[PDB]
Specification:
By secondary structure, this protein is of the alpha+beta class. The protein is built from three helices and four strands, in the order βαβββαα. It has a four-stranded mixed β-sheet with strand order 2-1-3-4, with helices on one face. It is rod-shaped, with a radius of gyration of 25 Å. Bound molecules: magnesium ion (8 copies). One magnesium ion binds next to loops. The structure holds one RNA strand of 136 nucleotides. It is classed as ribosome. Keywords: Mitochondria, mitoribosome, alga, ribosome. Large subunit of the Chlamydomonas reinhardtii mitoribosome. The protein: mL43. Organism: Chlamydomonas reinhardtii.
Length: about 130
RNA sequence: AGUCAUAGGUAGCAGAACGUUCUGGAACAAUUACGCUGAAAACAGUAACAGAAUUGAAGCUGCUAACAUAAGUAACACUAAAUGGAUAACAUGGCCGUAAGCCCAAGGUUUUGCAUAACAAACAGUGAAUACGGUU
């Protein structure tokens, strides 16, 4: 969530009726998705059905970004931790990695950055001796 | 789901998995896929459970095919010699002349003739009549 706004506007879930890779996804829809819907009231969860394709998990973000994740052969615990990563993020991918100082700010230097002029008056008295 | 303990490795040994082709379980792509990302890796994004393997390739001066490099480089020097706005019929000059001329043999087997581009090989051509060579 950025500035209080939740940033994950919609989640799209695609599955299969007969496919064996969608056993965990059908179990997740049947027993675990009402808890996800109750715990996340800002979310919008769609339910699309693809009768011959592997289960997918498409996350739609409020900055216009979209990220498709495939969840074939996954238990409902692994699907829930995938949605935990999708919900708690802004959607940046595998390639982004953030600034290495781990710090980012407008206005770093209160009192002004050190320059050539900050301690000019003291250094001439230092050179006086 | 909180604390601890362990995690360098060649040869070797052990354990867990990914992927390719085919088959059984009635049929998992007629009208495709395409939010561009996910995962520790092999990878994934058109089942799953089992099974059968000509099942995984930068690495054998391996084989096959294609494409580069050297490189527009080397070569286009055995000879008589060419010129006139043409590989000219005409003119000028030169070279061989016991050959670079003429007639045959062996061998080749149509390589032989025709169009100031062309639509032309699809068309022509080898005649024993001097007691020519053979066949005897
Ligand atoms: Mg070790
Ligand atoms: Mg150690
Ligand atoms: Mg079958
Ligand atoms: Mg399928
Ligand atoms: Mg083999
Ligand atoms: Mg040249
Ligand atoms: Mg001439
Ligand atoms: Mg002859």
């Amino acid at each position: 969530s950025k500035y209080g706004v939740w940033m994950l506007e919609s989640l799209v879930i695609k599955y299969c009726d007969i496919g064996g890779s969608s056993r965990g996804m059908r179990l997740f829809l049947d027993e675990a998705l009402p808890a996800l819907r109750q715990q996340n009231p800002q979310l919008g969860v769609q339910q699309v059905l693809q009768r011959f394709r592997h289960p997918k998990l498409v996350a739609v973000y409020r900055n216009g970004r979209t990220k498709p994740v495939c969840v074939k052969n996954l238990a409902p615990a692994e699907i829930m931790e995938h949605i935990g990563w999708l919900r708690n993020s802004h959607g940046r991918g595998q390639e982004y990695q953030v600034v290495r100082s781990r710090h980012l700010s407008r206005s770093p230097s209160i009192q002004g950055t050190w320059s050539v002029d900050t301690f000019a008056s003291q250094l001439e008295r230092v050179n006086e001796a």
